[PDB]
From a paper:
S from both SARS-CoV-2 and SARS-CoV-1 uses angiotensin-converting enzyme 2 (ACE2) as the cell surface receptor (Hoffmann et al., 2020, Li, 2015), ACE2 is expressed in a number of tissues, including epithelial cells of the upper and lower respiratory tracts. S consists of two subunits, S1 that mediates receptor binding and S2 responsible for viral and host cell membrane fusion (Walls et al., 2020; Wrapp et al., 2020). The S1 fragment, at the membrane distal tip of S, includes an N-terminal domain (NTD) and receptor binding domain (RBD). Although both regions are immunogenic, the RBD contains the interacting surface for ACE2 binding (Lan et al., 2020).
Unexpectedly, we found a 10-fold increase in neutralization titers when the heavy chain of mAb 253 (IGVH1-58, IGVK3-20) was combined with the light chain of either mAb 55 or 165, which have the same V-gene pairing (IGVH1-58, IGVK3-20) but a different J gene, having IGKJ1 in contrast of IGKJ2 in mAb 253. Remarkably the sole difference in contact residues is a Trp for Tyr substitution in mAbs 55 and 165. The most common configuration observed for the spike construct we have used is 1 RBD-up and 2-down. In our structures, we see Fabs 40, 150, 158, and the chimeras 253H55L and 253H165L binding to the spike in this one-up configuration. Whereas the lungs of isotype control mAb-treated animals had infectious virus levels of ~106 PFU/g of tissue, we barely detected infectious virus in animals treated with the mAbs 40, 88, 159, 384, or 253H55L. At sites of disseminated infection, notably the heart, spleen, and brain, all anti-SARS-CoV-2 mAbs showed protective activity, although mAbs 384 and 253H55L conferred the greatest reductions in viral RNA levels.
Author numbering:
A (entry chain H): 1 to 138, 144 to 224
B (entry chain B): 348 to 545
C (entry chain L): 1 to 214
D (entry chain A): 447 to 496
The structure:
C-alpha cells in the first residue's frame, strides 16, 4: 500500500496562511524526496518546489520563492507546505509527489501522487444553495435544476435519488462576481413521460449541510 | 571531531584512574559492555583506544553494540563482542551556536553498512536512483554528509553531546596499561597474608 | 528557466488510431530526467513513461517514448477509450522542474448539431428580485459553439456566463449552459428573451425565444 | 524479546557454594549512599536476558 494522502479542502480568507499536509506510506520516507505542484482550475501544472526528505534541503520556483516554504517531519513521515499571504490567485488544487524507495535506493521518477488538496481564497462566507426549477417548454424535452448562490465548492446533484442517470448533464460551476457559485443540471426526457413521471433533483451541499429535493413541474 | 570523522587516540603505558570519571555526575552516560563498570581498575590490557566524536542526544542510544540507526550504520559501528565503555556528556555550552553550527557533520546516505571500527570520510555523491550522478547534485543524487545545526535553544534530545568510547585491546604482547592498584596499611609483628608488588 | 512546450493543443482522434504527442524544451535536457504524466478530470496525474524510454509499473505496453535533447515524442500505438485525457511532459533535471501546458486528447466524432432549449427564470427566483434565463446546448460536436443573448432584439454583452461539460463517455459530445442574469426591474422592462446558437452543425444560427408571461 | 529471565549483575561479594541471593537492594556502585533510591551509581542488581 504505497500511498500518499493529502489534507482536506481548505477555505481561507485573503491575507492568511495555509499549511497543506502530505503523508507517505508503503515506502521508506527517510530516503525519498517530496515535490509540490499547483494547478489552477482549468489551467496547466505549475511546479512549486521540491524538498529532500533526508536532508531537508529545499528548492523553490521563482514565482513561489516569496510565499511558499516546504518542510518535512520524518518522525510522523509527513511533509508540509506553508503558503503565506493568500490571495484569490492562490485558489487552486495542490499535489504532492514522491518516488517510492526501499532502505537504500529510490525510483527514478515521481510515480506516487496524492489525491490533491483544493485551496479556495476569497472573502465569501458559507452559504447554502438556492435550487430553482428549469421547467420544460410546452419529441424530446429538457428540464433541470439551477443551484445558485452557494459557497464554497462543490455541490452534488442527482436525479430520482440516483435512478435517472441517462441523458443527465451536470455542468461545472461558474464563479460569479458576487463571490458565489452557480451550477446548472439538465436532463432530456421523452415528451410523453412529462405527465406520468415525477422528476425531483437532489442537491446536496456538505460544507453547509444543505439537502434540497426540488420537484420540477411542467407549467 | 565530527562523528563521521571520529578521532582515535592510542594509549600505551600509562596509569589511569577511572574512578574520578565514574564518580562524576558531569557525564550524562557511562555504560560499559563486556566488562563491569564498577570493576574496571583491576583489569589490565596491553593497549587502549579512545574514539571521540560529537552527536546529538537522540543518537546517544545508538553508540552501543548491536544497535542500528544513522550513526551506527553510516558513521560509527561497534562490534557485537565489544569489550569497553562508552561515555557521553552534554556539550551544549561548547558545540552549539545560535543559528546552527556548521562544523559537525554526519553521514546521511551510504549503500552498505560500516564494518566495526570503520572510518568513512568519503564525499562521493550518493546515487539513490539508477541514473548515475556525475558529480552534480539533484534528483536521487544527494550529498552524503549533513550538518547537525546545533543551537542552544534546541531540545535536549537535539543538543550536542560529546561521546568517548574507550576500548581495551589485548594482543600477543606484554600488557603495558595497568590500573591504579591502590594499597592499604601494613602491620608488623602479626601474622598477615601479604601481597607485595608481584 | 527551462520552458516546456507541448503539442498539439487538442488532439482529436478516433478510438483505435495511433496518437503522437510532441514535447519541446528551450534547451537540451537529459533524456533520463524527463517524465510523462496523464491526468483525467477530477483525478491526480499518473506517471506513464520516465527516462524518455522506460515504461512505468502497470502502464500498458502500447505507450512508448522517444526523443533526445530538445525534442521528445510520446506514441500511443492503439488509442483506447480509457486513454482520452490530458498529457503533460516534465523535465526534472535542472531546477526549476517546469511542466508543459498540456495536451487534450478527445474522441473524434462526426459533426452533430446542438439541441437548443431556453428556460425562463422561475417565479420563485423572481420573488428574490433577480432573473436568470438559461440556454442549453445539448449533444453537439465539436466543442466550439457560440451563444448570443437578445432581449427585445437587443444583443446583450457582459451580463452572461457560460459553462461547458467534459466530453461524454458514451456519445463523445459536449453540452453547454449559458445563464443571463438580470435584475427584476430590467427583467420586467422587456418581453421577448432569446438565445441565438451558432455552431458548425447548424446551416444557420438557430434562435430559441420566449415571451415574458406566455 | 523475552525479558522474564533475570540475572544478578552486581553484588558486594561472590556467592558461597549453593548460596542463593534474591535480594533486590539497590547496589551502591559509588561513594554516595542510595538509601533505596535509584539513580546515578545506584543500580537495580538484576538485569533481564535478551
Ligand atoms: C532497493 O531497490 C533497488 C532498485 O530496485 C528497482 O527499483 C525499485 C523502486 C523497484 O521498482 C524494483 O522492482 C527495481 O528493481 C535495488 O537495486 C537493484 O538490486 C537488484 C538485485 O539483484 C540488482 O539486480 C539491480 O541491478 C539493482 N538496481 C540498481 C539500480 O541498483 C536494491 O537491491 C534494493 N535494496 C533492497 C535492500 O531491497
Ligand atoms: C552475608 O551478609 C553479610 C551482611 O553484612 C555480608 O557482610 C556478607 O558478605 C554476606 N555473605 C556473603 C557470602 O556475601
Amino acid at each position: 500500500q504505497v500511498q500518499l494522502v493529502q489534507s482536506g479542502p481548505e477555505v481561507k480568507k485573503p491575507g492568511t496562511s495555509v499549511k497543506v499536509s502530505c503523508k507517505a506510506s508503503g515506502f521508506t520516507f527517510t530516503t525519498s524526496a517530496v515535490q509540490w505542484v499547483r494547478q489552477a482550475r482549468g489551467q496547466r501544472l505549475e511546479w512549486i518546489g521540491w524538498i529532500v526528505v533526508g536532508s531537508g534541503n529545499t528548492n523553490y520556483a521563482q514565482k513561489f520563492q516569496e510565499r511558499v516554504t516546504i518542510t518535512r517531519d520524518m518522525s510522523t513521515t509527513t511533509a508540509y507546505m506553508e503558503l503565506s499571504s493568500l490571495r484569490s490567485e492562490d485558489t487552486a488544487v495542490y499535489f504532492c509527489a514522491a518516488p517510492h524507495c526501499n532502505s537504500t535506493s529510490c525510483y527514478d521518477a515521481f510515480d506516487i501522487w496524492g489525491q490533491g488538496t483544493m485551496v479556495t481564497v476569497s472573502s465569501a462566507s458559507t452559504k447554502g444553495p438556492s435550487v430553482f426549477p428549469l421547467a420544460p417548454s410546452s419529441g424530446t424535452a429538457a428540464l433541470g435544476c439551477l443551484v445558485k448562490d452557494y459557497f464554497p465548492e462543490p455541490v452534488t446533484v442527482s436525479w430520482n435519488s440516483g435512478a435517472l442517470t441517462s441523458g443527465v448533464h451536470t455542468f461545472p460551476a461558474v464563479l460569479q462576481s458576487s463571490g458565489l457559485y452557480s451550477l446548472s443540471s439538465v436532463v432530456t426526457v421523452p415528451s410523453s413521460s412529462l405527465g406520468t413521471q415525477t422528476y425531483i433533483c437532489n442537491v446536496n451541499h456538505k460544507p453547509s449541510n444543505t439537502k434540497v429535493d426540488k420537484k420540477v413541474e411542467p407549467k | 571531531a565530527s562523528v563521521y570523522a571520529w578521532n582515535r587516540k592510542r594509549i600505551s603505558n600509562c596509569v589511569a584512574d577511572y574512578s574520578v570519571l565514574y564518580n562524576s555526575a558531569s557525564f550524562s552516560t557511562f555504560k560499559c559492555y563486556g566488562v563491569s563498570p564498577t570493576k574496571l581498575n583491576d583489569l589490565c590490557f596491553t593497549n587502549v583506544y579512545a574514539d571521540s566524536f560529537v552527536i546529538r542526544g537522540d543518537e546517544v542510544r545508538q553508540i552501543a553494540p548491536g544497535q542500528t540507526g544513522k550513526i551506527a550504520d553510516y558513521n560509527y559501528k561497534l562490534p557485537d563482542d565489544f569489550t569497553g565503555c562508552v561515555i557521553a556528556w552534554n556539550s551544549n555550552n561548547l558545540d552549539s551556536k545560535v543559528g546552527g553550527n556548521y562544523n559537525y557533520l554526519y553521514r546521511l546516505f551510504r549503500k552498505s553498512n560500516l564494518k566495526p571500527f570503520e572510518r568513512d570520510i568519503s564525499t562521493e555523491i550518493y546515487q539513490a536512483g539508477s541514473t548515475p550522478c556525475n558529480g552534480v547534485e539533484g534528483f536521487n543524487c544527494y550529498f552524503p554528509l549533513q550538518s547537525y545545526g546545533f543551537q542552544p535553544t534546541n531540545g535536549v534530545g537535539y543538543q550536542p553531546y560529546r561521546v568517548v568510547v574507550l576500548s581495551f585491546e589485548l594482543l600477543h604482547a606484554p600488557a603495558t596499561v595497568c590500573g591504579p592498584k591502590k594499597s592499604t596499611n601494613l602491620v608488623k609483628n602479626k601474622c598477615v597474608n601479604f601481597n607485595f608488588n608481584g | 528557466d527551462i520552458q516546456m512546450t507541448q503539442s498539439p493543443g487538442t488532439l482529436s482522434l478516433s478510438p483505435g488510431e495511433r496518437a503522437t504527442l510532441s514535447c519541446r524544451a528551450s534547451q537540451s535536457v537529459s533524456s533520463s530526467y524527463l517524465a510523462w504524466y496523464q491526468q483525467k478530470p477530477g483525478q491526480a496525474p499518473r506517471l506513464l513513461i520516465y527516462g524518455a524510454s522506460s515504461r512505468a509499473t502497470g502502464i500498458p505496453d502500447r505507450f512508448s517514448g522517444s526523443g533526445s535533447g530538445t525534442d521528445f515524442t510520446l506514441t500511443i500505438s492503439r488509442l483506447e477509450p480509457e486513454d482520452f485525457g490530458v498529457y503533460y511532459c516534465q523535465q526534472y533535471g535542472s531546477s526549476p522542474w517546469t511542466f508543459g501546458q498540456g495536451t487534450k486528447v478527445e474522441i473524434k466524432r462526426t459533426v452533430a448539431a446542438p439541441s437548443v432549449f431556453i428556460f425562463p427564470p422561475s417565479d420563485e427566483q423572481l420573488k428574490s428580485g433577480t432573473a436568470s434565463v438559461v440556454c442549453l446546448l445539448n449533444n453537439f460536436y465539436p466543442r466550439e459553439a457560440k451563444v448570443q443573448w437578445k432581449v427585445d432584439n437587443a444583443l446583450q454583452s457582459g451580463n452572461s456566463q457560460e459553462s461547458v461539460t467534459e466530453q461524454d463517455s458514451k456519445d463523445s459530445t459536449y453540452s453547454l449552459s449559458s445563464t443571463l442574469t438580470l435584475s427584476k426591474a430590467d427583467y420586467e422592462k422587456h418581453k421577448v428573451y432569446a438565445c441565438e446558437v451558432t455552431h458548425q452543425g447548424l446551416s444557420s444560427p438557430v434562435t430559441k425565444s420566449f415571451n415574458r408571461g406566455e
